[PDB]
């Protein structure tokens, strides 16, 4: 905890991230072969021979066809959802998940984690630098509610204002600037010690890291990155940020009475490129998401 400009903080954070990723890649010495199997439906019995801790499941979908690259959003390594750009470890059996599948609930949760994380990325770089922004967390709300939510403490100077429609449309236009550049959701699975050594300043991030490290016995939390943003989340993400097509932040709401300081919950709604809606239905969904989502218990 010290005085730091907001840019040298992201410099030291993504430099430490790149150092840990280089160490993760360098720990394995050679090219080890793993035999990932395809236990899906369409092309059964296919067995790839991959490079261990190098090859992604996107690099397994590239072997088959281009449609496995276009429409597959999450992998399913043996029982567990694996994000499409995470290097495989052991000899496994794999299966790809799409948006128009029969039971897409896991990939819906993954999509809304990724959209809430994008909203945090677009909130944290839009405010005045003399004001302080502390990204608290994104609580895992179910997708049956209309919007994804992200929790942010604003400045002590700003316990009185609320944004008009122009600031919200500025937020969505910056989020569309984020969407228009096709960026990879890069993951990295780090120990709790290195992860706590990354952040070091946001005490809200510190207790969230401790909460996610307390539940597994190895103390490993899931870090992710879009470009130069680094955030904590539970579970996997979607591959690219260009999968989102219709994006919007709806409103903000203040939830005071549980705490002295004021936490502001930013809300917004999204839809992928394969599941886009007509303008009328989209305005209906945009209209519902202004109401406050409260599903935490």
């Amino acid at each position: 905890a010290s005085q730091l400009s907001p840019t040298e903080l992201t410099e030291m954070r993504n430099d430490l991230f790149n150092k840990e990723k280089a160490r993760q890649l360098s720990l394995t010495p050679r090219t080890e072969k793993i035999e990932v199997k395809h236990v899906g439906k369409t092309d059964p019995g296919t067995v790839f021979v991959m490079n261990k801790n190098i090859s992604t499941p996107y690099s397994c979908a590239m072997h088959l066809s281009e449609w496995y690259c276009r429409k597959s959003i999450l992998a399913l390594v043996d029982g567990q959802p694996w994000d499409m750009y995470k290097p495989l470890t052991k000899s496994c059996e794999i299966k790809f998940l799409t948006f128009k599948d029969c039971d897409p609930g896991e990939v819906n949760k993954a999509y809304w984690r990724s959209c809430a994380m994008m909203m945090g990325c677009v909130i944290e770089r839009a405010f005045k630098d003399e004001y302080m922004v502390n990204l608290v967390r994104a609580p895992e709300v179910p997708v049956i509610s209309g919007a994804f939510c992200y929790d942010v403490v604003l400045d002590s100077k700003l316990d009185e204002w609320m944004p008009t429609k122009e600031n919200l449309r500025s937020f969505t236009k910056d989020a569309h600037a984020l969407i228009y550049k096709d960026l990879p959701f890069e993951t990295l699975e780090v120990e709790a010690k290195v992860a706590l050594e990354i952040f070091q300043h946001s005490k809200y991030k510190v207790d969230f890291i401790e909460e996610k490290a307390s539940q597994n016995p190895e103390r490993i939390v899931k870090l992710h990155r879009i470009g130069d943003f680094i955030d904590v989340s539970e579970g996997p993400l979607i591959p690219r940020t260009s999968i989102c097509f219709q994006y919007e932040v709806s409103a903000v709401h203040n939830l005071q009475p549980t705490q002295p300081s004021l936490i502001r919950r930013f809300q917004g709604v999204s839809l992928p490129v394969h599941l886009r809606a007509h303008f009328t239905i989209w305005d209906k969904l945009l209209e519902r998401s202004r109401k406050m989502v409260t599903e935490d218990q």
């Binding site: 439906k41 369409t42 092309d43 449609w67 429409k71 128009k100």
Partner: protein, 108 residues
């Protein structure tokens, strides 16, 4: 009437290569949900339709064996059975065609 002059290759390339004569890219195409063999929207998948027509052909061959000659065409419903698969009580009067296979996991 006859041509008065030979059309050159410049005029011909201007005619036979414009976007009104080129082949239009279509984008109705996606993978089939079962069997992944690249159907078109608004069109049944040719692989799945080939599956169904092969099984229908074998059922029709067994029907043609059971009906003897032509002009027979019974006055009862028919129903097909695979190996195992005892006739249900609701299919009592219905004609029973049993070929020999396991029941495939799309015909239920």
């Amino acid at each position: 009437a006859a041509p008065k002059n030979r059309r050159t290759i410049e005029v011909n390339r201007c005619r036979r290569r414009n976007p009104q004569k080129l082949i239009k890219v279509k984008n109705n195409i996606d993978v089939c949900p079962e069997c992944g063999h690249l159907k078109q929207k608004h069109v049944l998948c040719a692989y799945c339709y080939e599956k169904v027509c092969k099984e229908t052909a074998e059922i029709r061959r067994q029907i043609g064996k059971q009906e003897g000659g032509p002009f027979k065409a019974p006055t009862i419903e028919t129903v097909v059975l695979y190996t195992g698969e005892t006739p249900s009580e609701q299919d009592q009067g219905k004609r029973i065609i049993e070929r020999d296979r396991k029941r495939p996991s799309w015909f239920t």
